């Protein structure tokens, strides 16, 4: 069904309680990679990232997050569905399933849909991901209208990470064309801190 | 290449995250990286300095952004990826000794805890370079506890709680691959190490 690493993380998350004060970062490797409470100097921020995760993988593990009725969920997902050849509209339909379930199970949770980050094939790594760099904007052009339809926030990380001239991630933020260096996380911190702190 | 790029991702992140005199650092490889330590201990002072794929000299090489903050405690778990490279228990211990002496020199007030290398199990046919070397885990631990005594630091026997009967292999209840931990595995680690974390 899913990877052994997914099972390790998911079974750990089943043992860690979520409370009404928690601010959850939910996603794939790009979420897994950070120390979120340290980045925000906020003990209420928690990591629910799993390297390799896909939209259906996130859907399938919502229960141990939404049952705690967290204050906030920041979602960043879809780039591993891109590497499977799934079209943008199909990915957005799956993200709609996630948003609908969070709203139904925990209506007081503030949900923030984060733009899929750009990617770059310059490093010749993750070719399934980085060769489909044009799908990122395709997703984001449909994700912003989804947010507006469902009454949830859309956060444009993408415009801060992209190079205008290429449509690809600025190499200053990555060593592989997909994941973030520390500088990358500091930029994400600067963009989303006002939303993390908002009442 | 994926381990080398992931190391630089995590290391460069840790260079941007300040360490303070209250902090309790979990330092190691994937088995440290895989936890949410502050959630496990319900303790905002506990921080993750784990990097999947890391080896003893990769931990040595990135001590500066941890020891400069003079943390209260460092819990070290390292070595199994050196085992998987065919490196001898003796050479592994020599590199752990380098880590211990550098921590003591740079941050003498830091309490250092050397955690037994965890057992492994070849029953899932995964990570063969690791799991087929299950006998090297006790070879290291039999030298690691004397090293802890010689350097005046704590040795933490996790291994005896995780190992099955007298097979010298990890109990499959704690793992789905013979190397890494399920949530149940981190709860056992929590139960063993919480009294050390809680030390005044
Ligand atoms: Mg770069
Ligand atoms: Mg098992």
Author numbering:
A (entry chain DDD): 24 to 222
B (entry chain AAA): 23 to 222
Task: Quote the study that presented this structure, word for word.
Therefore, bacteria employ esterases to make acetylated sialic acid more accessible for cleavage by sialidases.
A crystal from the Apo I condition diffracted to a resolution of 1.44 Å and had P1211 symmetry, while a crystal from the Apo II condition diffracted to 2.06 Å resolution and had P61 symmetry. This conformational change is supported by a hydrogen bond between the hydroxyl of Tyr25 and the carboxylic acid of Asp83 from the neighbouring protomer. The result of this change in conformation is that one active site is more accessible and has an ‘open’ conformation, while the other is still ‘blocked’ by the N-terminal α-helix. We suspect that this conformational change may be important for the accommodation of large, complex glycans that contain acetylated sialic acid. The high resolution of the Apo I structure allowed the identification of a malonate molecule in the active site of PvSAE. As the most N-terminal α-helix of the Apo I structure has different conformations, the two active sites accommodate the modelled 9-O-acetylsialic acid in a different conformation. In the ‘open’ active site, the 9-O-acetylsialic acid is positioned such that the 2-position projects towards the bulk solvent, indicating that this site could accommodate larger glycans.
